[PDB]
Paper text:
Coronavirus S glycoproteins fold as spring-loaded trimers transitioning from the prefusion to the postfusion state, upon receptor engagement and proteolytic activation to promote membrane fusion and viral entry. This metastability, however, constitutes a challenge for producing the S2 subunit (fusion machinery) in the prefusion state in the absence of the S1 subunit. Here, we set out to design a prefusion-stabilized SARS-CoV-2 S2 subunit vaccine enabling robust elicitation of antibodies targeting conserved fusion machinery antigenic sites to limit the impact of viral evolution on immune responses.
To design a prefusion S2 subunit trimer with a native quaternary structure, we selected mutations from a deep-mutational scanning dataset of cell-surface expressed S using a library spanning residues 883 to 103442. We first evaluated the effect of three individual mutations introduced in the C-44 background, namely T961F, D994E, and Q1005R, which were among the highest ranking based on their expression/fusion score ratio. We recombinantly produced each of the three constructs (designated E-31, E-32 and E-33 for the T961F, D994E and Q1005R mutations, respectively) in human cells and characterized their monodispersity by size-exclusion chromatography (SEC). Residue 961 is part of the heptad repeat 1 (HR1) motif whereas residues 994 and 1005 are located in the central helix (CH). Single-particle electron microscopy (EM) characterization of each negatively stained glycoprotein revealed that the design harboring the T961F mutation (E-31) formed prefusion closed S2 trimers whereas the other two constructs, harboring either D994E (E-32) or Q1005R (E-33), adopted several conformations, including one with a splayed-open apex similar to C-4417. To unveil the E-31 architecture and understand the effect of the T961F mutation, we determined a cryoEM structure of this antigen at 2.7 Å resolution. Our structure shows that E-31 folds with virtually identical tertiary and quaternary structures to the S2 subunit from the prefusion S ectodomain trimer (PDB 6VXX41) with which the protomers can be superimposed with r.m.s.d values of 0.7 Å. The engineered T961F substitution, which maps to the distal half of the fusion machinery apex, reinforces interactions between HR1 and the central helix of one protomer and the upstream helix of a neighboring protomer (cavity filling), likely explaining the compact, closed trimer conformation observed.
Numbering used by the authors:
A (entry chain C), B (entry chain B), C (entry chain A): 706 to 810, 813 to 828, 833 to 841, 848 to 940, 944 to 1146
């Protein structure tokens, strides 16, 4: 519902913390085309060669993906090359960050430990065999390690957190310039159209709301990571497909191959083998094609995650719903299995009241407009106040400016404007 | 052309409304792999099985697309879960929205009705047969319904429009805070560097320009939707491909299959059938691969559409050419066949004049800089004015600030600065 | 390191120019499916036909890519349809642009000439044969020209540069409004939270830092374009794959085809040919699939490049690290082989000092907060100054506002606030 002469203004607010989860990378894997199709079989390999460079081209396609996975990770996390550490003082004006910062007693935060025990991991079996020996045991299917291990990533997130708390966003665009945390917040409030005194006067309340919100995150995650689990599940499916297809005949007398090389005459075996090669090759092509498309989807997500790091963590965003719902104040990154988790801190208006309003005020024949905020009435008196928080002030010449006259504006009301000068000169 | 001592400033402006069309989704379809390849043929099915899980993997790929289509739609439209309705008063200060709001006498707006009669729709034939019976008649090719029907989508767009008009952007980031429409506009003007008095003084003109612009949209659309039609046409092609390939022999004696099962001996038929299976299977793979790539393109468009909803409709954008050409004021969404249409309202400078300018003014040995706007000369007198609209004001101590001295600045000119105090004390 | 009572403020700054390179398009190519598979062979063509419309569908897929390549180019470059030229005066207040502007004595800039001699170019051989004759010589593989030639692109970049220098960003959102360059910069400084006097007082230094930075770009590029070279290299690989596969037997007696048509009996040749057709067809499908995926990657890059043009060149960005590291002032586009190069001009804080700070000042029982900037102490006196550049000013009633009282704020310090009125009345 709405009207043409009344406005609603929040008289209170709350602080909310929301969680956004993005995938960044996937397990780096590859397939040895020849070993997969022709498992330690000289005759098969000789028959595979006549088909040209199919295996070379497919090996290249998969290699490109494996490399991309490291590129994605470093672009998201390794944005700041200087490593920063937090002080032992732990005095941020009542703001308790003990749940997001690394625990000295792996050096990860409490929240990160929760995340790393929610994602559930062929790959297990490969890890157990541990590399040529494994490659043979798993029919050409191998698993590659990342360049950046979990510990290295944790160090990057730690540096970002230490930076954000100590020097705000300045370290993300130049030298790290230390500032008291309570002050850092004041400017984040200004950035959302709220004056500084609101923070300083309500600092205790704000710190309490913030600390409570963080505790809620723990309960929310404990009782969420489907987006990251789904990536793992899809990859498990793709690998299971390749393994199962090795048991298919596709018109052959046997998927074994060795039962074709033996028993059958040379040329007879060759026909049956060429058949198996064709079927296994197209099975591999199907796998590769889907991996390329899926990889592209992840790349797009990694690019978004990198963007959010720059705009949500290393600065303050003015883009609606980009860094969480409500008005963006700040963000804190956390590491996660093959991904990144953002904790977005936002300002949300709470309890509003209805006031009578007017576009402009007529004083001495001239129309006065507010420099900022709106004109409102409590039923007997008119006040000027900021839009995002009810804080009524006397309407004075230092709160308004003059333009045109009282005969032009439609929604013009008669009132007085206080002049903070003459009354103390007379 | 340009110079080093002169500036051009707009003395008038116009309001423009532009239309941007994005695809969000495509018809949800799927293919029953076995039915397509082996149409009610026991012998064929038995020969298909030996090829492994190809059909399972392909069915999964297509299913994933069909699901994604609903995900895309709800992300774009279902951003606000609270449904809002407009009042019967229809008083928005002279702004006529009767062409964008739903018509009580399907509950769609006039403009939406135009859009829904411009897109032209295998699919027609399927709709006519209406589900197993149809699946058999169409050789395994089926069509699935959306979770959100056109009526439900219209309700979401209606809620967004009611919200935008009544509470501006506040409902997109918290509680809906009612405000007079004319005032809402004032703040949208501030957001583009234009003062409030410009709107209130020219409210009648602005409303007329706006209303005229909307009427032009009707003529533009009536006399546009190629982006949405192209998506339909591409999908029609892909389905036609699958159907036509069922008439190909690919070396077989016949594409009929039944003419192979009969006449030929058991093993003879089996060879001819295995051939048909291979050709039909690779034809299906070709279709699926292209559908996956095309689907990715749509997803990317849906993500952009969702972003625009949040940044153009539920707020005011500061990104150049993101929400139309010119300075962004506001946007209004409209529904469309498998897509979304945005009407972008922008401010455009009209008629500029040339003025002589100067970086700073020297008064009593000190250099005065403008707090905002520029210093300009009309040939005899110097004035200070805002950049996006010519509105010359007297240069006073309340319009400028002092820094350094007259011997530092290169483009320094001699003039007087009026002090709005002493003249009324003496 | 950080503390709860001290702040660091830059006392100097530098100007940096960084280079960002994006791909926009790739060489437009296509393959004549029939000619590739059946090179001037009637018998082969007749055997190809029985396989249905595979070639038609593949030809369409490749055609779609070739068309997209022109769409990508025009979206990035042809954003402004009006062509602008620079004056012969070349007076921009000490800013030397002679290295980015076109050289009258191809009409390209010095920097562009460097870029166009760094990218290294099957395609060479095709250019040498120069169209049916070539298509036959190269087995159905052809090369298509762009709609926009290098000269036309250079004209678009020239217009953008002339526009940016003469009318700033206004031409990107309406009529081109001339402004002195030195003034244009002043507003770009305001956009990053720095006052105007900083530019005008240090204009000479700033121009020198800028001019030096540009010279560094020449040395950087001369001593970089791997992103663009990689695109070329990948395409060369894809084409080499197709050519090499024409020498594969895939079980055939010969890849020659003519040695199959001859020697062998009609039905014997037909079997061997059907085999070759199947292998060549799947080789072509592999090529096409990878081209579609790669093309999508380029499209995404072109979309980003187009976005940067609008937000970095035709305006000033507030997005962190979107238009280079540091605080964005402006950008200048340069053309490049199948891509675009952006020179990003950014402001970077240099040498900071430590000061003692305080949230608010207590005067006569009331708490005074800064209208802008921070309160700092040099050890004996308190001052108020802007955050991004140390410039200490006397704390006065015109620099602060009053809210609440001295008993509410925690970090409250006792000091005096100067009233710029009474002292000259008494
Ligand atoms: C910051 O928050 C943590 C977590 O709630 C607080 O740690 C708890 O402190 C209580 C009181 O001593 C103990 O009983 C709990 O066992 C502690 N929990 C954990 C996980 O250690 C910490 O005291 C808070 N610090 C401040 C300054 O508020
Ligand atoms: C603004 O809302 C907050 C709640 O977020 C109010 O603070 C609560 O006040 C009640 C008493 O009415 C206490 O029991 C709660 O413990 C307080 N919560 C917190 C986090 O301190 C606050 O009083 C409200 N202020 C106004 C002006 O309404
Ligand atoms: C509107 O606000 C004014 C100012 O606060 C209210 O007037 C004051 O009311 C208090 C009692 O709560 C008196 O002690 C003050 O002396 C009054 N000041 C003046 C100038 O009259 C006024 O009552 C409020 N109106 C409504 C409807 O709440
Ligand atoms: C808002 O715009 C609509 C559409 O132009 C106006 O409706 C027309 O009003 C005239 C005058 O009565 C009729 O002759 C037309 O037939 C109406 N057109 C339609 C489609 O209904 C409407 O009157 C305008 N309302 C206001 C307040 O301006
Ligand atoms: C600004 O431009 C508008 C046009 O958009 C002018 O308004 C028109 O004025 C003519 C008379 O010269 C009328 O016949 C038209 O009907 C008016 N159009 C509208 C929509 O009202 C306006 O006068 C110009 N103002 C200035 C100062 O130049
Ligand atoms: C520049 O603007 C000034 C102020 O409007 C013009 O001076 C006024 O001109 C009007 C006639 O149109 C006189 O009635 C006023 O008394 C003049 N005021 C003053 C202070 O002289 C001035 O003529 C304009 N200059 C040009 C070239 O247009
Ligand atoms: C702008 O920069 C160019 C490039 O450095 C300057 O051109 C050089 O000028 C010197 C001095 O006359 C010559 O010795 C060099 O050979 C010139 N280099 C080139 C490439 O032409 C130009 O003089 C500068 N102009 C201004 C106003 O600073
Ligand atoms: C700010 O930094 C600049 C360097 O970017 C200083 O300018 C240099 O000053 C030295 C003398 O100390 C000269 O030899 C250099 O040639 C100057 N460089 C340039 C480009 O002019 C500047 O003096 C510093 N200003 C302050 C206040 O520290
Ligand atoms: C803090 O700044 C003040 C103001 O500049 C310094 O006081 C001045 O010092 C100069 C000598 O450099 C004297 O000539 C002025 O007369 C002093 N002014 C006043 C009001 O005392 C002060 O010394 C600086 N403090 C520190 C630690 O540098
Ligand atoms: C404001 O007025 C609207 C419309 O009557 C009403 O629905 C809403 O509850 C009112 N809010 C308050 C705080 O009175
Ligand atoms: C507000 O709307 C009412 C009709 O409900 C009308 O009578 C009144 O004049 C309008 N007020 C203004 C300032 O337009
Ligand atoms: C405002 O006061 C003037 C007299 O100075 C009077 O003529 C006018 O009608 C009044 N307007 C209103 C809304 O009371
Ligand atoms: C402003 O000056 C330029 C350059 O001479 C000229 O092209 C333009 O038409 C002039 N505009 C006006 C309104 O005089
Ligand atoms: C403007 O350019 C002219 C040359 O055309 C020059 O003589 C004049 O001094 C310049 N003015 C300023 C303020 O630089
Ligand atoms: C400005 O006035 C001063 C005298 O106060 C004079 O010395 C100076 O040359 C004048 N500057 C100009 C541009 O007229
Ligand atoms: C500021 O203080 C920090 C912490 O002691 C120190 O590391 C830094 O070097 C100091 N900077 C200056 C300019 O004194
Ligand atoms: C700053 O921190 C110190 C502890 O290191 C503390 O004693 C002091 O009171 C704090 N100052 C303020 C304003 O909080
Ligand atoms: C500020 O001055 C008041 C007296 O007006 C005194 O009571 C208070 O303690 C002083 N505060 C500080 C920090 O010196």
């Amino acid at each position: 519902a709405c009207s043409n002469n009344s406005i609603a203004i929040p008289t209170n607010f709350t602080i909310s913390v929301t969680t956004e989860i993005l995938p960044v990378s996937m397990t780096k894997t590859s397939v040895d085309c020849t070993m997969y199709i022709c498992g330690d079989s000289t005759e098969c390999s000789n028959l595979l060669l006549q088909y040209g460079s199919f295996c070379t081209q497919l090996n290249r396609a998969l290699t490109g993906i494996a490399v991309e996975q490291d590129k994605n990770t470093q672009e998201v996390f390794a944005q700041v090359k200087q490593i920063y550490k937090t002080p032992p003082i732990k005095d941020f004006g009542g703001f308790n960050f003990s749940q997001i910062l690394p625990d000295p007693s792996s050096k990860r935060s409490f929240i990160e430990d929760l995340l790393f025990n929610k994602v559930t991991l062929f790959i297990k079996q490969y890890g157990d065999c541990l590399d040529l020996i494994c490659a043979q045991k798993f029919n050409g299917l191998t698993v590659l390690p990342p360049l950046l291990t979990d510990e290295m990533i944790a160090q990057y997130t730690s540096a970002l957190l230490a930076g954000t708390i100590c020097s705000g966003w300045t370290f993300g665009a130049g030298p790290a310039l230390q500032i008291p945390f309570p002050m850092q917040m004041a400017y984040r409030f200004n950035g959302i159209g709220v004056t500084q005194n609101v923070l300083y006067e309500n600092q205790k309340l704000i710190a309490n709301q913030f600390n409570s919100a963080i505790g809620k995150i723990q309960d929310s995650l404990s009782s969420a990571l489907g987006k990251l689990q789904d990536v793992v599940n899809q990859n498990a499916q793709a690998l299971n497909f390749l393994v199962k297809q090795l048991s298919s005949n596709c018109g052959a007398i046997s998927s074994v191959l060795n039962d074709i090389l033996s028993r059958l005459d040379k040329p007879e075996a060759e026909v049956q083998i060429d058949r198996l090669i064709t079927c296994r090759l197209q099975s591999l092509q199907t796998y590769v094609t889907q991996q390329l498309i899926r990889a592209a989807e992840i790349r797009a997500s990694a690019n978004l995650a990198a963007t959010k790091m720059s705009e949500c963590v290393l600065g303050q965003s003015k883009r609606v719903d980009f860094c969480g719902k409500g008005y963006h104040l700040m963000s804190f990154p956390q590491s996660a299995p093959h991904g990144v988790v953002f904790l977005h801190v936002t300002y949300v208006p709470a309890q509003e009241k209805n006031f009578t309003t007017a576009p402009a005020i007529c004083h001495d024949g001239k129309a006065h407009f507010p420099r900022e905020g709106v004109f409102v009435s409590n039923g007997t008196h008119w006040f000027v106040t900021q839009r995002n928080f009810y804080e009524p002030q006397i309407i004075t010449t230092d709160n308004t400016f003059v333009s045109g006259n009282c005969d032009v504006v439609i929604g013009i009301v008669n009132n007085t404007v206080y002049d903070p000068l003459q009354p103390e000169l007379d």
